[PDB]
Design an enzyme around this catalytic site. Structure first.
Site, mmCIF file in Angstrom:
data_model
loop_
_atom_site.group_PDB
_atom_site.id
_atom_site.type_symbol
_atom_site.label_atom_id
_atom_site.label_comp_id
_atom_site.label_asym_id
_atom_site.label_seq_id
_atom_site.Cartn_x
_atom_site.Cartn_y
_atom_site.Cartn_z
ATOM 1 N N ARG A 80 -58.780 -44.954 -29.806
ATOM 2 C CA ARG A 80 -58.469 -44.916 -28.374
ATOM 3 C C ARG A 80 -57.365 -45.920 -28.004
ATOM 4 N NH1 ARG A 80 -63.702 -44.124 -25.800
ATOM 5 N NH2 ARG A 80 -63.186 -41.911 -26.089
ATOM 6 N N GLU A 116 -64.232 -38.919 -20.136
ATOM 7 C CA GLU A 116 -64.547 -37.571 -20.634
ATOM 8 C C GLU A 116 -65.726 -37.662 -21.571
ATOM 9 O OE1 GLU A 116 -60.640 -36.420 -22.328
ATOM 10 O OE2 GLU A 116 -60.698 -34.712 -20.933
ATOM 11 N N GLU A 117 -65.677 -38.611 -22.513
ATOM 12 C CA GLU A 117 -66.742 -38.886 -23.472
ATOM 13 C C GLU A 117 -68.133 -39.039 -22.758
ATOM 14 O OE1 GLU A 117 -65.855 -42.327 -25.939
ATOM 15 O OE2 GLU A 117 -67.651 -42.023 -27.185
ATOM 16 N N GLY A 118 -68.159 -39.766 -21.639
ATOM 17 C CA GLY A 118 -69.344 -40.005 -20.828
ATOM 18 C C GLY A 118 -69.745 -38.785 -20.022
#
Lengths: 592, 593
Positions: free
Chosen positions: B156, B199-201
């Protein structure tokens, strides 16, 4: 005798006509309203567009038919509405004290009344433009179709604290959706049309405006081409823009040849971000807006940072290299009026002080400073102590008089360290930073394009035009750095003489000094600095142009440069969505 | 009774008429490749597809089930860093590298990536061959296999252009599988991409609500009102996910939550996360780098052992480690040995401070041009002007000794990880959404939404305490109950027994085995206490706080795991027309010569 069979062919033709009429498309005039909620004012923009209704296709706007009929009067800006409301309901000097924001929820109707006064003036103005510019036949079509309203706020309330601004928008929309039934004009809005626009969006919409008006942007065979692999490219290169407004500056440019960027830099694809429909050619555009870089904004912060440096401030006198020799003013960031007698009248009113927005943001009572050291440091590095009361926050300490020294090189170096390349980002620039750019110097460092660039903004243009008027720059000037620094060095070295006819700028050649030009040299230094950073980029723009307006098909401008046309296009080009929102639901969605 | 024989013939016609009218169900395989901080691993799923005449083909979202999560192969960080070691030269972390020169080694980056992709492909094929029967293979093989390789916290913060060039190479490799096996794998730039922490969350928030039956579009999970607005039948729940390198906090806002202009909440429909037919929700989603298990372990030792209060005479007194426990002073990988001793791996790549010390470099444009980021590095005792080796070194420190002081542990976790003076490095995403730290999350926004706590160690924290009966079976998230229990367990003694090392509980409460996974578990108990306190401080309280290893699917057994994997699938599969075009119309055939 048998030649009167023309009567037979007349009757068949009356039938044939009537049937073509019931099978063809029908054109109708529609009016569109963009309300520019800017830093210094709230202003109406009335547009006219051609709509077409086709059997089994619905209704659509012809994008090339969009034209500005009039940009109206400068009314109360949204910051003033909000700060007047806080003045009455949170109490005076809420800028220097802790305020319980929860307690302000009991004053929402009072905010509605504040918002109502402004919206009544704008509606009155919009309706007068519509009544005076249209014939009766045109009014029928405009009154029948309904009038989409797009009120968008920019840099002025972009940095506004707490929940207040987002609550104002809720009230503004209800106000727009309930116009007076008297005039007959069916104004209407929704949360997609009427909302605050981010700096990046403000920038993206001015980029869409420029390219649309200049005929660089299009999806038809005249402005684009499909390759052997079905990819639609524009025939002409899409141009980027630099717009320097009242409170912020935007830098927007398309990335050429599908370039590889560093991971930290966030470019925006026009199609994937739903800015332009899929039928339009694709582009990855860098769009970044800097707070404190607008005309009023940078003037207040420049004085405050320059006159806090002992190289400039000595024994009560701040020597300003960006100001003319012979020029003298009171040591304040207050609005300057160049009087007929040659003297500089500095306005004492706190609302008219150019540091007011920054000093209002830069307070320990604002949760954005209170909870975040980074934001406090940013304030302090620009000589604003958030712990001090508002009056001393905007005060230039131990300074009585500012005296112009007219030294262009020292001005360029000062604009560079203070505005273009500061140690820390200028306050309220989390949007820019999140994009990968903390300051202007970082823009052309991390991303560069061969895309042509257009420089816009009243004072950006007056900088080049003044030098062209005195024959210091060639009329065909194309952004030559050395040619501009030499012209400005000469112009800025001018003495101010106070004569019978008032203050004059003397050139070894003369022009009158006024409130619009007294500090034009700061903008020349900003242009020079920006061109230098552009010239150091890995890829350099194909050309650079300074344009006041773009001429339309009839050698006359269809509309002004800026975000207004772009915000319209961003909605109207999405044919299916626009048809449902503007025509199916329409003003009738408000029947109560 | 010939009237019976004529009815068999009419029946034969009706059966064939039904067949050409009815919808047909078919099995499809879907692959999610988790390119995380610790490893790159495959995730093989099966779903029921349905084709209806004049309606095309779609996936039944409820049929989505995980078959296997594959082996832990090299992380994308390692592939990129190994490539830099060869083409930018050794110790590129301590010297300036011209990034423009590295473009001539792009084919070599393709070769590095090819080694990894072939290991992931062999694993994916072995998983399918082992689970599918001959009829199931035929359907799965014919249909095409969408692949969604997404990268998280590990890359990231990767510097320059390297990672994005890697993604273009990765998609080329996926779109060219081994023809020998017959599994028609394929990807596109929409499925295979780096996913933000937000987005991951959001994807993990979708997985919880999907599997728990809270998120739905049908009458069983939703209800349309008299004003045509579709509401969720049950409250949507929020998620706290603690991974290897980052931690995510996601919760829906209950209308009308008072939001400051600075806090940017996501509308699921508006932001194209969920289709318009689904109930609307405004979701706060924030991810914090350096808050994951491995990254926080490294940072914690750096900050704690560079503090005069804890470092004295080359001994760092760690309150988060047990009394009697000792280790060499480094943020290297710890192995608990049978003889009570702790073995610290001295390999730089195995060191838990490497990703931070690699980001925090004066030769990284994110440091050299941004004082902001340089100061966040320095506030965590990392001088970016120094070589990598001394940037990872805990200065004048030889031994880390455990003091088993829970309150001191909580105190330091709060100070270093939860509420630091400056945001923790590489958190521009969090800061842009309005949050510099975990403490600010429940302060500027809070919800009455029920909350679920997830992560390997997050669960082990509550589980260990329950096992020694310091916590009740009915533990609902009481801060003081938890702080009391953890204080007792964390004041335990390390005793060396014939069978191996043991964590001996005080007041003869019993014991448990000492290992490489639980030796520093108290740090996570302290993080939990800290999170629950901030959550309790909120204007709005979560209706319930739950800890779950897994969500029970229909027919007792869980259908899939918690995490972002199911959510990324749904993010694509739920947009019916667009999924039909990408998955079925263009498909694996887009790749044909």
């Amino acid at each position: 005798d048998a030649d009167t069979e023309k009567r037979i062919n007349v009757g068949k033709t009356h039938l044939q006509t009537l049937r073509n009429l019931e099978t063809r498309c029908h054109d109708s005039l529609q009016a569109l309203v963009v309300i520019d909620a800017g830093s210094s004012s709230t202003r109406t923009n009335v547009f006219l567009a051609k709509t077409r209704s086709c059997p089994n296709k619905g209704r659509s706007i012809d994008p090339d038919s969009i034209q500005l009929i009039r940009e109206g009067k400068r009314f109360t800006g949204l910051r003033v509405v909000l700060e007047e409301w806080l003045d009455t309901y949170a109490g005076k000097d809420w800028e220097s004290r802790p305020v319980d924001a929860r307690l302000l929820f009991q004053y929402v109707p009072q905010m509605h009344e504040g918002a109502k006064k402004l919206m009544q003036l704008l509606e009155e103005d919009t309706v007068a433009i519509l009544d005076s510019q249209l014939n009766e036949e045109q009014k029928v079509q405009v009154k029948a179709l309904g009038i989409p309203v797009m009120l968008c706020s920019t840099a002025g309330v972009r940095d506004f604290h707490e929940w207040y601004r987002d609550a104002l928008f809720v009230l503004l929309r209800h106000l727009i959706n309930n116009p007076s039934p008297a005039h007959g004009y069916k104004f209407f809005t929704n949360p997609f049309w009427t909302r605050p626009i981010t700096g990046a969006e403000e920038g993206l919409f001015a980029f869409i405006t420029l390219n649309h008006l200049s005929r660089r942007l299009g999806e038809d065979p005249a402005r684009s081409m499909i390759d052997e692999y079905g990819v639609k490219h524009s025939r002409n290169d899409l141009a980027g823009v630099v717009e320097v407004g009242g409170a912020s500056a935007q830098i927007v440019f398309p990335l050429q040849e599908g370039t590889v960027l560093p991971s930290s830099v966030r470019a925006v694809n026009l199609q994937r971000e739903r800015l332009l429909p899929e039928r339009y050619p694709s582009a990855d555009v860098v769009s970044v807006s800097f707070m404190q870089l607008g005309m009023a904004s940078s003037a207040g912060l420049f004085l405050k940072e320059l006159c806090s440096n002992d190289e400039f401030l000595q024994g009560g006198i701040c020597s300003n290299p960006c100001l003319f020799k012979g020029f003298q003013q009171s040591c304040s960031a207050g609005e300057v009026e160049v009087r007929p007698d040659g003297s500089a009248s500095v306005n004492e009113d706190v609302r008219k002080n150019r540091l007011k927005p920054l000093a209002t943001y830069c307070s320990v009572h604002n949760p954005e400073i209170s909870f975040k050291v980074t934001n406090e440091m940013q304030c302090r590095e620009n000589s604003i102590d958030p712990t001090k009361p508002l009056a001393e926050r905007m005060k230039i300490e131990n300074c009585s008089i500012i005296e112009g020294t007219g030294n262009f090189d020292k001005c360029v170096s000062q604009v560079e360290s203070i505005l273009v390349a500061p140690k820390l980002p200028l306050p309220a620039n989390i949007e820019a930073a999140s994009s990968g750019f903390e300051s202007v110097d970082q823009v052309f460092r991390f991303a560069s394009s061969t895309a042509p660039m257009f420089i816009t903004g009243r004072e950006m243009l007056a900088s080049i035009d003044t030098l062209k008027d005195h024959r210091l720059l060639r009329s065909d000037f194309s952004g030559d750095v050395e040619e501009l620094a030499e012209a400005a060095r000469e112009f800025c070295s001018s003495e101010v003489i106070i004569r019978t006819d008032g203050p004059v700028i003397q050139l070894p050649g003369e022009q009158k000094l006024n409130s619009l030009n007294f500090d034009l040299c700061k903008t020349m230094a900003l242009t020079v600095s920006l061109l230098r950073h552009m010239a150091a980029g890995e890829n350099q723009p194909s050309f650079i142009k300074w344009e006041k307006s773009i001429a339309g098909p009839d050698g006359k401008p269809l509309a002004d440069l800026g975000w207004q046309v772009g915000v319209i296009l961003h909605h109207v080009l999405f044919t299916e969505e626009w048809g449902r929102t503007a025509y199916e639901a329409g003003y009738s969605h408000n029947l109560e």
